[PDB]
Amino acid sequence: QQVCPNYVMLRSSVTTKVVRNVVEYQIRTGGFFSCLAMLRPLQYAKRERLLGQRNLERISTRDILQTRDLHSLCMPTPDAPMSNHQASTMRELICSYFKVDHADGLKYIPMDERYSPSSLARLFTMGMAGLHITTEPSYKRVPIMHLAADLDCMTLALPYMITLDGDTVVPVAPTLSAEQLLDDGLKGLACMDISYGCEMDSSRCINELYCEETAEAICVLKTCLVLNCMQFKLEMDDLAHNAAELDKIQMMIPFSERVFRMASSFATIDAQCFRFCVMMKDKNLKIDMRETTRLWTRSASDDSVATSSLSISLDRGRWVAADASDARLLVFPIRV
Ligand SMILES: C[C@H](CCC(=O)NCC(=O)O)[C@H]1CC[C@H]2[C@@H]3[C@H](O)C[C@@H]4C[C@H](O)CC[C@]4(C)[C@H]3C[C@H](O)[C@]12C
Ligand SMILES: C[C@H](CCC(=O)NCC(=O)O)[C@H]1CC[C@H]2[C@@H]3[C@H](O)C[C@@H]4C[C@H](O)CC[C@]4(C)[C@H]3C[C@H](O)[C@]12C
């Protein structure tokens, strides 16, 4: 059963079965798990690295086009939500990273300045893996970032925001949306960290790999995470008003729990995702997708949840928001 056919992250499939009159669900969340894999650039490309250019040429062949194909091509996606936030700035980045002309940057980001955030992350993540997906169907080899190799053994990653209370890098709740970290020359990103680990055990922070070589790659990895957040937020905003698509699943409670897990990925870098996840644990996750949509649109209000009263800290490789002898949110690290 297809859900969100023309979405990138929400794109999911549901298989339902009966074994002696017992109701069984299975939800297959597709593009989402593809998108978060981009925290390990080489692991993402590992697949496509051993597919030739015919993999792409047979796609630009078609006239149907659709979302899943435009994504693979790293092009803007009509029939899907798109953003224009700091599009000017993002186009400059493409030209710098891939060292190409403005005429080619305009292929990725039209004059419209509308683009799919997950189609840029894929582009940059593939770029960090040493493959540039070009304007005209092709894979061109570019230098493989040493950072991408340095992280290619890690199976856990936990992004979080930090500040300083005096002389200690201390985790904080997000104040801003992910969308605001991209602007101002991407200088917001300094206050993001990503903790990687094996097994957490071998915990190593991406900010502790800071080097004049890796600084370029370290920023792109963060940008790709922010962009995948933007995509998720766009699709939830669009899903809210797509009353047609919404009605396919409005009562499928096991799906609300799945959307909750998806937002949890971004609940430490995006204030709206934070508040949205906090509200659902308060309700114990047993929520209709129609009500969940209402909670998503509610979370857009800063006063929706009292973030200011919550104490943030890390323990055991997991992110905790709590107050008054009772935790409100646990966020676990992202697989791969
Ligand atoms: C947390 C502090 C800023 C003080 C603060 O808490 N402000 C929160 C706020 O902006 O509201 C920032 C400012 C300078 C940062 C460092 C510099 O940008 C240089 C360098 C940049 C790297 O992107 C991440 C490591 C780090 C050492 C950074 C770690 C951390 O990112 C620092 C030490
Ligand atoms: C932070 C990284 C790496 C800087 C570095 O090489 N070492 C710094 C150091 O170690 O001292 C740089 C490399 C290319 C930069 C981008 C490009 O120059 C294009 C464009 C230029 C604008 O001035 C600010 C936004 C940005 C997207 C830039 C943001 C950011 O400024 C980038 C992504």
Numbering used by the authors: 19 to 217, 230 to 366
From the primary publication:
In the case of mammalian orthoreoviruses, two nonstructural proteins, σNS and µNS, initiate VF formation, and σNS recruits viral RNAs into these compartments. Our crystallographic and biochemical studies reported here provide a mechanistic understanding of how σNS forms filamentous assemblies by linking dimeric units through domain-swapping interactions of the N-terminal arms and further how such a multimeric association is required for the RNA helix-destabilizing and RNA-annealing activities of σNS. An important finding from our studies is that mammalian orthoreovirus σNS has RNA helix-destabilizing and RNA-annealing activities without requiring a metal ion or ATP, which makes this protein an RNA chaperone.
To provide additional evidence for the role of domain-swapping interactions of the N-terminal arms in forming oligomeric assemblies, we engineered a deletion construct, σNS-ΔN17, by truncating the N-terminal 17 residues of the protein. The σNS-ΔN17 mutant formed dimers in solution and also crystallized in the presence of bile acid derivatives. The σNS-ΔN17 crystal structure determined using molecular replacement showed a dimer formed by a central core identical to that in the structures of Se-Met or native σNS-R6A with two bound bile acid moieties. As expected, no helical packing was observed in the crystal structure. Furthermore, the σNS-ΔN17 structure showed that bile acid derivatives bind to the same location in σNS as the N-terminal arm in the σNS-R6A structure, suggesting that this location in the σNS core domain has an affinity for cholesterol-like molecules and that binding to such molecules disrupts filamentous helical assemblies by competing with the binding of the N-terminal arms. As anticipated, RNA-binding capacity and oligomer formation of σNS were abolished by the removal of the N-terminal 17 residues and, concomitantly, the σNS-ΔN17 mutant did not have RNA chaperone activity. From our studies, deletion of the N-terminal arm of σNS abrogates dimer-dimer interactions and precludes the formation of higher-order multimers.
